[PDB]
């Protein structure tokens, strides 16, 4: 005939708290659809008198849901609170011990391309648009990283436990960054062809794959020319806080002092481990919970990164 109840409240983005009288009779799952108790689906549970107050994530299912999501998740697709309530459930039971100084992970469900991403986020100067990703890397910094985790994988449409590629990974979190100002200025002189410059905002600007090295792509990097010669390209000018410079991994040279830090690439094209470089007072390999130390460092690089401010060629 009729039911005890409680109140709880539901949200999709921990900030706007919806107060909702549950139905003790009632799994949470027959009452708002999917639900989560941080990360764990409590879909198929009763409300019991300990969640009382309590704060439950379900699924943007009406126009306020939807507008909460978009504003802190800057994501249309209903699924993504699914996607990242399912990585958190895993996410929230890894370690996130400080290595050096960063927050890192211990190696769990091939998270290896996640730590370098991790310790790679906190050495660049790179602000996140979405206030989800603001708020969660603000908390991974200071060691809490579980949060932050989760919606990198939900953002790149990954779950826990898939392979992952570090240049992929930092490739979506940069359209979520506020690269607006970022700009880069390429020349390319062919013999045959004459001199064509290209101008690239954004991602495009900070994004290099095909070198390594920051000093030979201003010193000029020999690619093909629809002609069939080899033309050079060489970069005239940048305006960016760091430059991402990638290649497939190959036995490489990182000199203490002459990049921020990079990504160690070690095994085949469908299976491997990522490692992460770093250059302070020495060069510093940070594997997961590991740490290792020496004055040089020859190995399979994929991504280099470096600081930078303004660039202008002398060429
Ligand atoms: C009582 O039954 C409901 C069911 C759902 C639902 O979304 N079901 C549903 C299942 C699987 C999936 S899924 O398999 O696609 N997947 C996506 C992420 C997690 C699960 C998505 C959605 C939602 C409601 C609420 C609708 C709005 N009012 C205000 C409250 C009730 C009631
Ligand atoms: C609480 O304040 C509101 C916010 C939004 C919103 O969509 N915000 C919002 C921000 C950034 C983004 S974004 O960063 O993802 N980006 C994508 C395309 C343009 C901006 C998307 C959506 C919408 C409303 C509603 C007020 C009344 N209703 C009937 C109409 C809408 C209220
Ligand atoms: C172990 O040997 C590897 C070789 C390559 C390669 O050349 N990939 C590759 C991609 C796009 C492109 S491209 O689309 O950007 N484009 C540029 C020139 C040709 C096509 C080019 C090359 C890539 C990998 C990665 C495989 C797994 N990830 C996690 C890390 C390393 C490993
Ligand atoms: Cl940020
Ligand atoms: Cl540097
Ligand atoms: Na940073
Ligand atoms: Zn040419």
Redo the contacts with the bound molecule.
Sequence with gaps: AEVRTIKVFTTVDNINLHTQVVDMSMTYGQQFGPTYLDGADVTKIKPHNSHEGKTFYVLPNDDTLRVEAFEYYHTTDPSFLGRYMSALNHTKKWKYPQVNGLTSIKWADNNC?LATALLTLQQIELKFNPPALQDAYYRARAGEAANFCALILAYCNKTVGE??????TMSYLFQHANLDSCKRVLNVVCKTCGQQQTTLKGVEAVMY??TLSYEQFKKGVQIPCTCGKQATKYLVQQESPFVMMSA??AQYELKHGTFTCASE?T????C?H?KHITSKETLYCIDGALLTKSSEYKG?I?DVFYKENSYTTTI
């Design positions: 391309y392979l992952g590629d570090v240049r992929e794959m095909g497939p991994p690439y095994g085949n094209y469908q491997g990522y399979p994929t």
